[PDB]
Amino acid sequence: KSPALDAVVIGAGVTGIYQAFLINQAGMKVLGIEAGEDVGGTWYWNRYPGCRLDTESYAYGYFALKGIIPEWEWSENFASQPEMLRYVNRAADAMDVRKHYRFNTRVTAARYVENDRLWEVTLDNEEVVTCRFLISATGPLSASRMPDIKGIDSFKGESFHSSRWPTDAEGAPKGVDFTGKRVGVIGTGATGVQIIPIAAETAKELYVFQRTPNWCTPLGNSPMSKEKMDSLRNRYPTILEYVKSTDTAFPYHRDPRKGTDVSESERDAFFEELYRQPGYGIWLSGFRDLLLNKESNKFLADFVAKKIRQRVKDPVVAEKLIPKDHPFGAKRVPMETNYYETYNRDNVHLVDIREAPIQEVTPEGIKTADAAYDLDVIIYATGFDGSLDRIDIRGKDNVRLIDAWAEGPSTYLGLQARGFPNFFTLVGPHNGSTFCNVGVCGGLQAEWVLRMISYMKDNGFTYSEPTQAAENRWTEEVYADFSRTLLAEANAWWVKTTTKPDGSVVRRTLVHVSGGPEYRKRCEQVAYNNYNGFELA
Ligand SMILES: Cc1cc2nc3c(=O)[nH]c(=O)nc-3n(C[C@H](O)[C@H](O)[C@H](O)COP(=O)(O)OP(=O)(O)OC[C@H]3O[C@@H](n4cnc5c(N)ncnc54)[C@H](O)[C@@H]3O)c2cc1C
Ligand SMILES: NC(=O)c1ccc[n+]([C@@H]2O[C@H](COP(=O)([O-])OP(=O)(O)OC[C@H]3O[C@@H](n4cnc5c(N)ncnc54)[C@H](OP(=O)(O)O)[C@@H]3O)[C@@H](O)[C@H]2O)c1
Secondary structure, eight states, X not given: OOOSEEEEEEOOSHHHHHHHHHHHHTTOOEEEEOXXXXXXXXXXXXXXXXXXXXXXXXXXXXXXXXXXXXXXXXSBSSOBHHHHHHHHHHHHHHHTOGGGEEOSOOEEEEEEEGGGTEEEEEETXXXXXXXXXXXXXXXXXXXXXOOSOTTGGGOOSEEEETTBOOBOTTSOBSSXXXXXXXXXXXXXXXXXXXXXXHHHTTBSEEEEEESSOOOOEEOOOOBOOHHHHHHHHHTHHHHHHHXXXXXXXXXXXXXXXXXXXXXXXXXXHHHHHXXXXXXXXXXXXXXXXXXXXXXXXXXXXXXXXXHHHHHOSOHHHHHHTSOSSSOTTXXXXXXXXXXXXXXXXXXEEEEETTTSOEEEEOSSEEEESSOEEEOSEEEEOOOOOOOGGGSEEEOGGGOBHHHHTTTSOOOBTTTBXXXXXXXXXXXXXXXXXXXXXXXXXXXXXXXXXXXXHHHHHHTTOOOEEEOHHHHHHHHHHHHHHHHTSTHHHHOGGXXXXXXXXXXXXXXXXXXXXXXXXXXHHHHHHHHHTTTTTXXXX
């Protein structure tokens, strides 16, 4: 029996529309499925106040760079979500991709039919579609869910989660004016950190509930003159080759020096100067051993801590905002606009919930182990888990994807897992998303998958699956690259260790950290050598 589609793509964010575009372009039949009303993914769903890029708008906008909408005009150096959402829509216009999608539609299950080499795709636990290939693009981050906190539904005031902020007919967020309300914000990752300073401008009082501080550095956002935009657009051919060559696809690359190759004075100037420069330079232009060597990371950590005490009046407030938990850059660094100067305000309080954990949410507000906080509003900036885990994906022998990866994700090329043939996992932590400029990384990985699909069609092949040897090898290499860096002991739960009954040890990182150009090259060695490592029939 023979599938109705060549490919189904789940997701209509930047990654998934580009992939769907590419397949219809190569003249094959594709069906996109999306949950939301429309294209956008991240830029469709997150509508919280202050939601902004951390990647230069000109560098994230691969669709402009690639010549699809090159005439696009960016209004700031780091676009806000509504502008981001307009960008994705215009790209969608140009690709003409929407007509290939079913919106308002959840994929509930996906099952591999080995007799027929195809995937049955279940829409809303109702309709079934068949495709030779299934491609997930379901996003590097999973879903809005309540945090694990008792009493949530009892609060008698307004309760927002950040990824589900209510909007008006215009699509703009509502209840953003907190005049004369007492507001609680839970979470200080990148989302909290964007929301807080804006919530502070109008709230009567504002309580920040923080389990662990992150390291955050200044965004340095500013408007984009028309002159600059034209200039950038003319240099798109160069910027593209440039972003294509850096390890993150950020327009930054590491300093060629070790930290100790300079004196203390010289490191200081170097740090001072980057710190004051917009964007991620402070992180991604740093010394080459910044994430490899404790002493090198301590230089910059110390420096950022100093900046934090400079910007925070109250010494005791400040030292709670400075991590000791962890090395600098060992998570994706939140970027901010006056985040620290918010806590200098009279009406703003930092609540340390490590020392005093939330005990529960109350019709009145919030209870910690040792105080109670009356609130008129609670905003849940509690972040995300993966996204595939919410679909019942079953491969050969009816094995669940979830069980296959219990001991850690296991793939070849971060793109297919053994047991799951003809299935591609685009953009996820396990193929690099965590530290990528995903506008670019995601786009390049889609074009590769398009190349493999086209090769299978051209040779009349209908079946692909990694061998066990090629999968074990890649997975051990991904782990090994990851162990050489500081993140390995930083993020204990990013590593799955299993000691199987036979008494053997398996190590897998949840997070792939190899450089992008080096990873794409290994992909191209594979593709050119007739997809050596995949079984093909
Ligand atoms: C607030 C925020 C800011 C960010 N800023 C940056 C940045 O500056 N730079 C950067 O590189 N990255 C950033 N990211 C990461 C971001 O995820 C990527 O930039 C990019 O948007 C990922 O696109 P995607 O298409 O791969 O996934 P997504 O944008 O998450 O799109 C996934 C889509 O598929 C849908 N879907 C999921 N499951 C199903 C299903 N079961 N059935 C039907 N549809 C489904 C979802 O509803 C969603 O529309 C940010 C993320 C967030 C949340
Ligand atoms: N472009 C940008 O500047 C930008 C903006 C938004 C998001 N992003 C991306 O989105 C990712 C996630 O960001 P995020 O801000 O949504 O989440 P996050 O960084 O994963 O953290 C969510 C916050 O909530 C806390 N928390 C989680 N569960 C809790 C609970 N049950 N009770 C109390 N506190 C809890 C966490 O503290 P603990 O650390 O102790 O768990 C953390 O500070 C980031 O890694 C970033 O890459 C980027």
